[PDB]
């Protein structure tokens, strides 16, 4: 019955936890607050595989 | 076959999806104890869900009937059968963990749903079937 | 005109109306110079601060301005005759349950006030168009400059 | 004799079904409690474990010996082991049983109670057999061995009343019932309709006359002619929990009188 | 054990809601498996 | 903050809770290994010089026993290994720290600890089992249920502590809190809902179940009252041998909705010499709200007895209810064909009408209130209407629950439950809002992959047309969930905000205290308030009253 | 706990024969308080319970799959069926005295789960005990006979209750408490005492006959000994300077 | 010890309301055009239908003889003789209010454990009661 | 709204009045526009009441902020409470913060 | 482990007795009978026999606590007739009626057949 | 000693405190636990807080209530003289 | 982890009838719910202790054992 999926390190078993992130090369408009000079901002951050 | 698709959120966008091939499909007295369901009478259907029942995860597959429950019911039921004494493993007799607990006499749910055929429920329950009274008797 | 008070007088006149089984057809033996003379000494002994000097003595009739107008309404002449029916034995049980009742609900000296405050508007706090609730309680007590949603009533 | 009346309906060497009338419901009560919680069986008490290979734990097998009913029908011959005079045990308070099952097969081998042996001078007496209730003549299933396992223990057995541990309960669910048409409104029937047609009738009404459809309440009966239904384990036959039952409640009732009559001579 | 498995994370200066159930979690995460505390909404469950 | 402000102490123990009814207000249960572990030093003197002496004998292996002999020159001898040289005479001026016993008096708490009244001392019970044990009706002082919860205990270790305990930190002194002048503690849960019952016009008691409730008040005088019906059958009232409990000398008059001296619907409520007259007792009475039983009992017969009459209410209603019994099932949450047929059509009628408002705006000839814009407005409108409908609904619903409806007698007596509840169970869970708002379009143009791009209809915008006893469809599944999400969160947050504003809040008006002279200074002496509250009153003696001067008309002023 | 969020810790136990029994002598081998199902809206908690009973009489396994066409009327008309009330309301008979409960209870069998958290491993008592190295208070924890934590909260409601001298038994005689010297022309803690020799200097000041002891907590001690090694000298003085 | 009050009242009509074993019953006097009653019944133990005729008497005691929580009550004894024999329904209450309602009008109010009673009629017929404990005896 | 006043037989009778609601805040400006009734100008933000009509006006303020929050939820808490909070916040001639710019920058002892 | 053993049901400990009677100063020929290792089984059947008597005047039982099985009996007779001769009653009528059943029983038993 | 006011121009309730009334007994319950004489004749009592009970209601306790002004000025009053009404 | 020997809720003995539950539903073709009837499982608190139990000792004894004499 055991699915595995985890690793044993020095006898421990431990499993990844998948971490969230954005994804990357896709372009975001943004709206700024009151309070700066910039109404809005187009920001992308670009990633090579 | 092209039977199935797989779908993710950024394509979900573009698709329209019927809950149920059994009344949203068709082209178009009732039981008053029955709920209320909206056909939504749509014609241009692209996909069907293969059970609605598969948006819950594998703790809230164990709650039977979770949606005649409050939300926040739900979610408390998901944390605490995590905490709940059962059979981790059949081999507990040769490893040698910090702690573990077992039950000497677990029991399959009497009502239990059918996401929990996969899960080994029925083949590693963690609980048991008692007789419940809900009644006022001694005040403790 | 229903406001928080410290003395229930009319609990005081429920019990000497019973302790003394008040005919209630026999007239009573008060007069109403007993009566009028009655209650006015009796704001007297009502003492919350014992200086001998005028300030304190100004502000002690300022501190029970409001307790003695709660106190002349209830012991008014015709409804002492008339509303309560009061016997002379009666009223003047009553008169010394107030004074003793009065003296018992003073502050007493030593008390952590400020503590006190504090719980007592801190609790209800955990239990929480215009900004409300425990945002506005943090823009109440943090004095901020730019509040979320300023208003002006105008009259 | 001209007092509780009883009147069997099924009698059964596990079930007994009769009527008591003319009794008060406090003794009606009684009767049944004390045949839950005071009646006097054997069971095993201690158990003693030299090897055990088994793939389940020595508490697991201890615990499921003790549940093991044994016959008592003479237990009443047999002592307290707090009330007799010996260091831990002897055979004038206790029945020693002994169990050793190998797994000499390749196939799985099953221990039952039946290889329960006893090793101690019964004196005559009628108790410590495990009772088999079955076709095969297997008991319980205590346990399951695979080649290479060996369970090898003693047990002792010692009389107690359930009010101790439920193991020496010599009775299973007692059904007791009373005015099954609720004439002395003791009950108020929750419905949404109609009460009489959203509740079934119990099987107990046909041995009383429905009501009177329009008589006026009485309100000066009182409740008697209870329904009951004993069910035994098979430790006692049944119709012993019933006898052994009123005789307990009996002998509690002298030992007050006795008590009293006591403290008027001291 | 299960549960465990198939957990996720999400790293919480960012100016957004990321603790709500949004829409778009539909059919792809538990809408009701969450812990119930400084990580409810942060840790998602498939 | 860690070490000075705030620092672990010895002498205290922790463990779960669990509520006993057959506890005082004012004892607590002690577990038999803490109160061994647990000791008091009590200094010899000729009137403890015999029962001091004894538990020494006893030892600290059996309770009540000793675990220490201190001498008058400081030493200390460990009755461990001390028995070697047989019995030790003790001397006046010594001290034998021995095993906490019953009544003596510790502080029992619960954190956060967010008021006072969460540390209250208690009068120890030594019981057996692993738990504490308390009365239920100081659990909402606490803030404390039996889901497992853990508190803590702290047992002083000299005289003057120990009377100081007693005689300002005692629960019965407690019963009235000075944050809100109203009493803090009530009759609750189970005896709250049996008191409501019993004292129907409907619940008559037979002599053998009357004698067994007048011996289990512990103040019962011996004198059994006349049956309020003597022929054909003596009968005792519910409120008959409730008002047993109630201390002579107590008069209470309250008035509600249309009630009159001969209340027809048996409501409000009129005691006189500690009989009740009339009126259903329930949480307007036995609760802990202004002007009820148990803040007149305190202020006019005294702290003592008011928690007297705590105990002898739950012995008398909880044995009451034991033989009667209370209970809740499904059949509790439906509703006959009838009034579903009405809930039903009451929900179609106002999708009809949100249908005939979206119309209107759709033609653009819907006028944007003022102030708010076209979308706002229509919003707005499809919300109240959408509101109204589970209102009336629910109104439906409750109006149909029988008396006899277990989920209606509790939200009657005020135990649990409310409309709300009764409708969503019932009725219609409603509409479901996120942010103070509908369902927002998460996609684009729609909220969810199922309905079509820019839809404001009730489901498609998260109305939940169904009940929780009916079940909800997924669509309105996950809209449910994501309300509730928006709960989880504000309630994690809320509690961290509301925190850290109330340690601001006790910090800066810590050091104010009201002096000999009457007034409100701070440390450094500076005058806050020349006199406390502006009156110089206390809350906890403060009652709200009518001023019959201000108001009226001139003509009744002069009459 | 249950599968809906219900959860609680066990308040007595009682047996058979004390337990409330119904017609057929069936005994409950849990009960609940029926408060907690109004509040909480837990349906399902009934429905499971309801659906529970049918499946038992009928030997089958109820399906509880959130969506589908499962109906409480339907669960109802086979609980009618085998001859139970259609709702799970049973006639109960009290134990103690064996007379009718004039409710009836909703009876039926459900699913429970133990939970992790036990009493045994939570239950724990300090008289004395070992003192941490740095601060000299109870150490924490309850596996190494630690004690509980007074914090600043459980402070502030003793200084509301006016409890001042409990407040220093908790901190002083319940805790660290540790004795020490003061110098009276300079408020350190740097006097010599040699009490075996019953001798006192403050090096420094070149006095032996101005020294007092103050009883203060030990981490009192180490706060002012702290703040002396980063160049802040805090001196303690048995007298007032200034006028109040 | 001896009748305060006595007279024959017409039952005009019966209340059941929200109980099922207690009925407000209005009822007017057969003599007496100025005398009505309002009084509560446990009809399951004395049923009550309209246009009956009801003797409505009111005691200070029960006791035959004159004798003008007093005392332990005590179940009757064999042999035991008092104004309750001669009635049917007799019920024990407190009179808690009496009211001017006109010139000559006044009504006394009284409760028997819970169930309230109002007896209004000319100054002249009840006069004798007062304001304290007294006996309700009924008879058909 | 709804206001009770004295009726001139001497009763309080409620009759409605019109009320204007504003978003934003010029309490200086306003109050001096001709048709408004000065005596009853109120502004949500206490902080332009003191700097416009006084201490002692923003302590009233203060105070009646504090209680429509508490009052908000439907909880009540005895005056004295809110108002030994209030003359603490104005006891020093301005409304000194809860944080530790406030009342924490006072002389009360470094320990404190 | 704070479980006490089961045995202190109805064991009688060290120092304890079956009975103890004191006086009522509340009422007259009205004493309190403290039953120790009982519990309902006695105290609902005694009380109840004691209710048939017409000489008796109160009777009532209570378990103050379940953690402890003892029960108290409290019982009021009238005058010149003894609270202790009224128990005495009571039990030896609860005995005979108990023979009665025992015996009845028996004899109907040996008359079915099936067992 | 400009900070002990005179009896005659006491200015303070006359009535004892909670505080107060606490402390005393308190205090007074620790000395009769140190074996102090007790002035008050006992029924049968083995609590010290008891006894002290039993002192105050009598009025015997010989201590005197320093009670300090927020200037350093004390009043002197006597346990016999203050009012124990609370 | 193998079948309880009592009922729970009553006491009734049950152990002894787990081979005989398992022959009826094999051998017999029969259902569930006859099955437990035929074997007197009257009420429901006896028919769940051995319709809900789950035999997890066979999954145990494919393991070899740890000691073989
Ligand atoms: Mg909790
Ligand atoms: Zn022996
Ligand atoms: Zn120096
Ligand atoms: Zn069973």
């Given at each position: 019955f055991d699915m595995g999926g985890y690793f044993i390190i020095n006898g421990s078993e431990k499993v990844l936890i998948a971490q969230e992130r954005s994804a990357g090369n896709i372009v975001q408009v943004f709206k700024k607050a009151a309070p700066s000079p910039i109404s809005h901002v187009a920001e992308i951050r670009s990633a090579l595989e | 076959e092209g039977l199935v698709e797989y779908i993710d959120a950024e394509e979900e966008e573009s698709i329209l999806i019927a809950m149920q091939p059994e009344d949203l499909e068709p082209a178009e007295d009732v039981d008053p104890a029955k709920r209320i369901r909206v056909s939504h009478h749509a014609t241009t259907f692209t996909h069907c869900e293969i059970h609605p029942s598969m948006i819950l995860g594998v703790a809230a597959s164990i709650i039977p009937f979770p949606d005649h429950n409050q939300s926040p019911r739900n979610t408390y039921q998901s944390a605490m059968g995590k905490q709940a004494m059962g059979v981790f493993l059949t081999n507990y007799n040769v490893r040698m963990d910090t702690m573990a607990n077992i039950l000497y006499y677990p029991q399959k749910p009497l009502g239990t749903t059918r996401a929990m055929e996969y899960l080994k429920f029925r083949e590693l329950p963690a609980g048991q079937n008692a007789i419940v009274a809900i009644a006022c008797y001694s005040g403790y | 005109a229903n406001w928080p008070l410290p003395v229930n007088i009319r609990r005081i006149i429920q019990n000497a109306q019973q302790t003394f089984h008040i005919d209630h057809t026999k007239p009573s033996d008060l007069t109403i110079k007993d009566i009028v003379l009655g209650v006015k000494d009796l704001q007297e002994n009502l003492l919350v601060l014992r200086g001998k000097n005028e300030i304190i003595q100004n502000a002690?009739?300022?501190?029970?301005?409001?307790?003695?107008?709660?106190?002349?309404?209830?012991?008014?002449?015709?409804?002492?005759?008339?509303?309560?029916?009061?016997?002379?034995?009666?009223?003047?049980?009553?008169?010394?349950?107030?004074?003793?009742?009065?003296?018992?609900?003073?502050?007493?000296?030593?008390?952590?006030?400020?503590?006190?405050?504090?719980?007592?508007?801190?609790?209800?706090?955990?239990?929480?168009?215009?900004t409300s609730g425990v945002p506005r309680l943090k823009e109440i007590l943090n004095v901020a400059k730019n509040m979320k949603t300023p208003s002006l009533t105008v009259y | 004799?001209?007092?509780?009346?009883?009147?069997?309906?099924?009698?059964?060497?596990?079930?007994?079904?009769?009527?008591?009338?003319?009794?008060?419901?406090?003794?009606?009560?009684?009767?049944?409690?004390?045949?839950?919680?005071?009646?006097?069986?054997?069971?095993?008490?201690?158990?003693?474990?030299?090897?055990?290979?088994?793939?389940?734990?020595?508490?697991?097998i201890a615990h499921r010996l003790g549940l093991i009913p044994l016959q008592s029908m003479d237990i009443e011959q047999l002592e307290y082991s707090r009330d007799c005079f010996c260091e831990d045990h002897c055979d004038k308070c206790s029945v020693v049983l002994t169990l050793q099952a190998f797994g000499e097969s390749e196939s799985t081998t099953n221990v039952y109670s039946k290889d329960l042996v006893i090793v101690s001078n019964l004196m005559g007496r009628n108790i410590g057999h495990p009772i088999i209730q079955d076709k095969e003549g297997n008991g319980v299933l205590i346990c399951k061995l695979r080649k290479g396992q060996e369970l090898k223990l003693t047990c002792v057995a010692k009389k107690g009343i359930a009010k101790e541990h439920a193991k020496w309960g010599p009775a299973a669910a007692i059904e007791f019932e009373y005015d099954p048409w609720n004439k002395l409104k003791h009950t108020d029937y929750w419905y949404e309709q109609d009460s009489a047609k959203e509740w079934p009738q119990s099987k107990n009404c046909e041995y009383e006359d429905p009501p009177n459809e329009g008589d006026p309440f009485d309100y000066?009966?009182?409740?008697?002619?209870?329904?009951?239904?004993?069910?035994?384990?098979?430790?006692?036959?049944?119709?012993?929990?019933?006898?052994?039952?009123?005789?307990?409640?009996?002998?509690?009732v002298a030992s007050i009188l006795l008590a009293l009559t006591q403290m008027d001579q001291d | 054990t299960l549960s465990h498995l198939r957990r996720t994370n999400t790293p919480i200066g960012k100016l957004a809601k990321p603790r709500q159930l949004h829409n778009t979690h539909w059919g792809l995460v538990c809408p009701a498996e969450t812990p119930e505390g400084q990580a409810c909404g942060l840790v998602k469950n498939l | 903050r860690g070490n000075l402000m705030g620092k672990r102490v010895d002498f205290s123990a922790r463990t779960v809770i669990s509520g006993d009814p057959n506890l005082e207000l004012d004892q607590v249960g002690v577990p038999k290994s803490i109160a061994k572990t647990l000791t008091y030093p009590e200094v010899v003197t000729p009137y403890n010089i015999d029962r001091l002496t004894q538990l020494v004998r006893n030892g600290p292996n059996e309770h009540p026993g000793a675990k220490y002999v201190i001498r008058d020159s400081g030493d200390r001898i460990d009755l461990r290994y001390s028995k070697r040289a047989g019995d030790i005479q003790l001397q006046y001026g010594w001290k034998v720290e021995r095993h906490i016993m019953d009544n003596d008096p510790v502080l029992f708490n619960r954190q956060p600890s967010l008021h006072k009244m969460s540390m209250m001392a208690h009068r120890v019970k030594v019981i057996p089992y692993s738990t504490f044990r308390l009365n239920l009706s100081v659990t909402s002082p606490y803030n404390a249920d039996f889901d497992g919860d853990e508190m803590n205990l702290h047992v002083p270790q000299s005289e003057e502590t120990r009377?100081?305990?007693?005689?300002?930190?005692?629960?019965?002194?407690?019963?009235?809190?000075?944050?809100?002048?109203?009493?803090?503690?009530?009759?609750?849960?189970?005896?709250?809902?049996?008191?409501?019952?019993?004292?129907?016009?409907?619940?008559?008691?037979?002599?053998?179940?009357?004698?067994?409730?007048?011996?289990?008040?512990?103040?019962?005088?011996?004198?059994?009252?006349?049956?309020?019906?003597?022929?054909?059958?003596?009968?005792?009232?519910?409120?008959?041998?409730?008002?047993?409990?109630?201390?002579?000398?107590?008069?209470?008059?309250?008035?509600?909705?249309?009630?009159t001296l001969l209340s027809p619907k048996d409501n409000g409520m009129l005691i006189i010499d500690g009989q009740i007259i009339f009126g259903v007792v329930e949480k307007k009475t036995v609760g802990s709200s202004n002007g009820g039983l148990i803040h007149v009992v305190t202020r006019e017969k005294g702290p003592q007895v008011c928690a007297k009459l705590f105990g002898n209410i739950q012995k008398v209603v909880n044995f009451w209810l034991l033989h009667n019994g209370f209970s809740t099932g499904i059949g509790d949450t439906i509703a006959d064909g009838p009034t579903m047929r009405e809930i039903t059509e009451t929900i179609a009628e106002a999708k009809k009408k949100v249908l005939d408002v979206t119309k209107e705006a759709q033609a653009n000839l819907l006028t944007a209130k003022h102030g708010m814009t076209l979308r706002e407005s229509f919003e707005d409108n499809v919300v109240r209407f959408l509101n109204e409908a589970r209102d009336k609904a629910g109104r439906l619903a409750e109006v149909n629950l029988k008396d006899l409806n277990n989920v209606k007698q509790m939200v009657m007596a005020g135990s649990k439950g409310s409309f709300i509840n009764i409708a969503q169970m019932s009725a219609c869970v409603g509409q479901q809002s996120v942010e103070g708002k509908r369902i927002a379009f998460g996609f684009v143009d729609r909220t969810l992959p199922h309905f079509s791009k820019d839809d404001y209809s009730p489901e498609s915008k998260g109305f939940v047309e169904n009940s929780y006893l009916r079940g909800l469809t997924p669509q309105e599944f996950f809209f449910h969930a994501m309300g509730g999400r928006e709960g989880l969160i504000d309630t994690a947050v809320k509690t961290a905000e509301t925190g850290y504003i109330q340690r601001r809040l006790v910090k800066a008006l810590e050091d104010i205290m009201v002096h000999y002279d009457n007034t409100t200074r701070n440390s450094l002496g500076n005058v806050i308030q020349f006199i406390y509250g502006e009156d110089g009153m206390d809350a906890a003696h403060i009652e709200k009253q009518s001023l019959d001067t201000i108001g009226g008309s001139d003509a009744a002023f002069e009459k | 706990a249950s599968r809906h969020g219900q959860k609680g810790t066990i308040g007595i136990t009682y047996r058979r024969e004390d337990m409330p029994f119904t017609a057929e002598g069936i005994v409950p081998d849990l009960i609940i308080n029926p408060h907690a199902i109004p509040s909480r809206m837990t349906v399902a908690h009934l429905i499971e319970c309801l659906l529970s009973k049918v499946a038992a009489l009928s030997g089958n396994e109820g399906d509880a799959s959130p969506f589908t066409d499962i109906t409480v009327e339907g669960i109802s008309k086979l609980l009618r069926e085998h001859g139970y009330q259609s709702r799970g309301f049973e006639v109960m008979y009290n134990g103690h005295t064996g007379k009718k409960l004039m409710a009836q209870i909703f009876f039926g069998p459900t699913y429970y789960q133990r939970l992790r958290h036990m009493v045994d491993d939570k239950i724990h008592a300090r008289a004395r005990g070992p003192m941490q190295v740095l601060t000299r208070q109870p150490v924490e924890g309850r596996s190494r006979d630690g004690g509980l934590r007074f914090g600043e909260m459980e402070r502030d409601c003793?200084?509301?209750?006016?409890?001042?001298?409990?407040?220093?038994?908790?901190?002083?005689?319940?805790?660290?408490?540790?004795?020490?010297?003061?110098?009276?022309?300079?408020?350190?803690?740097?006097?010599?005492?040699?009490?075996?020799?019953?001798?006192?200097?403050?090096?420094?000041?070149?006095?032996?006959?101005?020294?007092?002891?103050?009883?203060?907590?030990?981490?009192?001690?180490?706060?002012?000994?702290?703040?002396?090694?980063?160049?802040?000298?805090?001196?303690?003085?048995?007298?007032?300077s200034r006028d109040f | 010890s001896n009748t305060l009050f006595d007279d024959i009242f017409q039952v005009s009509e019966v209340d059941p309301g929200r109980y099922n074993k207690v009925c407000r019953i209005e009822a007017a006097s057969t003599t007496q055009d100025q005398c009505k009653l309002t009084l509560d019944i446990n009809v399951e133990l004395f049923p009550v239908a309209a246009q009956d005729s009801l003797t409505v008497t009111i005691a200070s005691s029960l006791n035959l003889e004159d004798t003008p929580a007093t005392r332990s009550w005590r179940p009757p004894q064999a042999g035991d003789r008092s104004l309750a024999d001669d009635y049917d329904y007799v019920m024990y209450g407190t009179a808690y209010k009496f009211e001017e309602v006109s010139k000559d009008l006044?009504?006394?109010?009284?409760?028997?454990?819970?169930?309230?009673?109002?007896?209004?009629?000319?100054?002249?017929?009840?006069?004798?009661?007062?304001?304290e404990n007294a006996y309700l005896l009924i008879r058909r | 709204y709804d206001r009770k006043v004295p009726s001139p037989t001497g009763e309080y009778v409620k009759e409605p009045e019109w009320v204007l609601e504003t978003d934003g805040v010029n309490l200086s400006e306003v109050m001096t526009v001709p048709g408004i009734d000065p005596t009853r100008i109120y502004t949500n933000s206490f902080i332009d009441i003191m700097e416009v009509l006084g201490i002692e006006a923003g302590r009233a303020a203060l105070y009646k902020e504090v209680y429509n929050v508490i009052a908000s939820d439907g909880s009540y808490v005895n005056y004295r409470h809110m108002a030994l909070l209030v003359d603490v916040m104005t006891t020093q001639g301005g409304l000194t913060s809860v944080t530790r710019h406030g009342f924490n920058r006072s002389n009360t002892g470094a320990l404190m | 482990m704070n479980a006490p053993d089961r045995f202190e049901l109805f064991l009688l400990g060290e120092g304890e007795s079956k009975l103890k009677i004191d006086p009522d100063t509340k009422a007259p020929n009205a004493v309190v009978i403290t039953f120790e290792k009982e519990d309902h089984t006695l105290g609902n059947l005694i009380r109840a026999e004691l209710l048939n008597d017409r000489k008796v005047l109160f009777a009532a039982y209570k378990v103050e606590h379940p953690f402890f099985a003892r029960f108290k009996l409290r019982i009021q007779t009238t005058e010149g007739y003894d609270p202790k001769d009224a128990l005495k009653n009571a039990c030896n009528s609860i005995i005979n009626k108990l023979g009665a059943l025992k015996t009845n029983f028996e004899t109907e038993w040996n008359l079915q057949t099936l067992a | 000693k400009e900070k002990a006011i005179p009896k005659d121009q006491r200015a303070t309730t006359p009535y004892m405190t909670k505080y107060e009334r606490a402390r005393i007994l308190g205090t007074r319950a620790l000395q009769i636990s140190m074996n102090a004489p007790v002035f008050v004749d006992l029924e049968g009592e083995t609590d010290p807080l008891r006894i002290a009970m039993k002192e105050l209601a009598e009025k015997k306790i010989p201590l005197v209530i320093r009670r300090y002004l927020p200037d350093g000025s004390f009043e002197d009053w006597s346990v016999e003289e203050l009012i124990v009404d609370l | 982890?193998?079948?309880?020997?009592?009922?729970?809720?009553?006491?009734?003995?049950?152990?002894?009838?787990?081979?005989?539950?398992?022959?009826?539903?094999?051998?017999?073709?029969?259902?569930?719910?006859?099955?437990?009837?035929?074997?007197?499982?009257?009420?429901?608190?006896?028919?769940?202790?051995?319709?809900?139990?789950?035999?997890?000792?066979?999954?145990?004894?494919?393991?070899?054992?740890?000691?073989k004499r």
């Open positions: - | - | 002690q009739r300022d501190a029970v301005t409001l307790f003695c107008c709660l106190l002349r309404s209830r012991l008014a002449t015709r409804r002492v005759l008339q509303e309560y029916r009061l016997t002379k034995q009666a009223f003047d049980w009553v008169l010394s349950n107030i004074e003793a009742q009065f003296l018992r609900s003073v502050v007493h000296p030593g008390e952590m006030v400020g503590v006190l405050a504090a719980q007592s508007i801190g609790e209800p706090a955990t239990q929480m168009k215009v | 004799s001209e007092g509780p009346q009883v009147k069997i309906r099924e009698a059964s060497k596990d079930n007994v079904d009769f009527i008591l009338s003319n009794v008060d419901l406090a003794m009606a009560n009684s009767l049944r409690r004390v045949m839950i919680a005071e009646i006097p069986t054997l069971a095993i008490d201690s158990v003693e474990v030299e090897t055990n290979t088994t793939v389940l734990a020595d508490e697991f000066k009966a009182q409740a008697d002619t209870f329904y009951m239904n004993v069910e035994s384990v098979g430790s006692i036959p049944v119709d012993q929990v019933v006898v052994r039952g009123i005789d307990t409640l009996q002998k509690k | - | 009377a100081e305990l007693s005689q300002l930190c005692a629960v019965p002194l407690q019963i009235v809190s000075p944050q809100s002048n109203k009493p803090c503690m009530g009759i609750v849960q189970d005896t709250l809902c049996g008191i409501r019952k019993l004292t129907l016009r409907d619940t008559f008691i037979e002599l053998d179940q009357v004698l067994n409730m007048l011996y289990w008040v512990p103040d019962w005088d011996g004198v059994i009252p006349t049956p309020a019906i003597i022929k054909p059958k003596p009968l005792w009232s519910g409120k008959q041998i409730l008002s047993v409990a109630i201390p002579n000398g107590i008069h209470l008059q309250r008035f509600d909705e249309g009630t | 003793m200084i509301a209750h006016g409890a001042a001298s409990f407040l220093k038994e908790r901190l002083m005689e319940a805790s660290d408490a540790f004795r020490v010297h003061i110098c009276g022309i300079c408020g350190l803690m740097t006097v010599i005492a040699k009490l075996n020799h019953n001798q006192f200097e403050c090096k420094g000041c070149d006095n032996k006959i101005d020294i007092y002891q103050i009883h203060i907590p030990y981490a009192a001690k180490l706060l002012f000994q702290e703040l002396m090694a980063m160049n802040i000298t805090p001196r303690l003085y048995t007298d007032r | 006044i009504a006394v109010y009284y409760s028997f454990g819970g169930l309230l009673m109002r007896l209004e009629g000319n100054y002249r017929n009840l006069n004798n009661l007062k304001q | - | - | - | 982890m193998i079948v309880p020997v009592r009922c729970f809720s009553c006491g009734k003995v049950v152990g002894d009838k787990w081979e005989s539950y398992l022959n009826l539903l094999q051998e017999d073709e029969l259902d569930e719910g006859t099955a437990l009837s035929r074997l007197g499982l009257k009420r429901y608190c006896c028919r769940r202790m051995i319709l809900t139990h789950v035999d997890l000792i066979e999954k145990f004894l494919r393991y070899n054992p740890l000691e």
